[PDB]
Paper text:
Since molecular replacement was not an option due to lack of sequence homologs, we attempted to solve the structure by anomalous diffraction using selenomethionine labeling. Unexpectedly however, the structure solution was greatly facilitated by anomalous scattering originating from an arsenic adduct (dimethylarsinoyl) to Cys81, formed due to the cacodylate buffer used in the crystallization solution used in the PACT screen (25% w/v PEG 1500, 0.1 M PCTP pH 7.0 (propionic acid, cacodylate and bis-tris propane)). For comparison we also collected native data from crystals grown in 25% w/v PEG 1500 and 0.1 M SPG buffer pH 7.0 (succinic acid, sodium phosphate monobasic monohydrate, glycine). The two resulting structures were virtually identical, showing that the arsenic adduct did not induce structural changes in Sap1. The packing between the α1, α2 and α3 helix bundle is imperfect and forms a deep cavity. Cys81 is one of the residues lining this cavity and the arsenic adduct previously described occupies the cavity without disturbing the fold of the Sap1 DBD. The structure was solved using a serendipitous arsenic adduct (dimethylarsenate) that bound to residue Cys81. This adduct did not alter the structure and shows that there is a cavity inside the Sap1 protein that can accommodate an organic molecule. The cavity’s connection to the solvent is too narrow in our structure to let pass a water molecule. However, the fact that cacodylic acid, which reacts normally with solvent-accessible cysteines, is found inside the cavity indicates that the pocket may be accessible from the solvent at least temporarily. We speculate that the cavity in Sap1 might play a role in a similar mechanism in S. pombe.
However, it has also been shown to bind Ter1 sites at the rDNA repeats where it stalls replication fork progression. Here we present the crystal structure of the Sap1 DNA binding domain which allows us to model Sap1 bound to DNA in its proposed replication fork stalling orientation based on structural homology searches and biochemical data. The overall structure of the Sap1 DNA binding domain (DBD) reveals a bundle of four helices, with helices α1-α3 making up a single myb-type helix-turn-helix (HTH) domain. In our crystal structure we have identified a dimerization interface between Sap1 monomers that we predict to be engaged in the direct repeat binding mode.
Author numbering: 29 to 133
Write the structure that this text describes.
Amino acid sequence: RTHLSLEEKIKLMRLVVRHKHELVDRKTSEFYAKIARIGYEDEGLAIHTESACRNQIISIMRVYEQRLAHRQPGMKTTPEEDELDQLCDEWKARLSELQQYREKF
């Protein structure tokens, strides 16, 4: 139930995207455990359980969708916002890929 800083959210999403091809459909536990471990060991995140790590990512993505939906033409963005948006877009695409695979075949 902790709150990540923007910096920590970017560090976490960098890891999620770097390791995105390691997520196996219906084996989420192993993936979010690994992300929590590497985030702690390398990026100085606090110790998170698997569930707490997964919830942080769910929350980042939920806020991302809000930001996307409320984006206005001509708005100013920061480089950190741009990076997080790009990382979230890439993670969303991975999740959608796995969904499509499960549904279609």
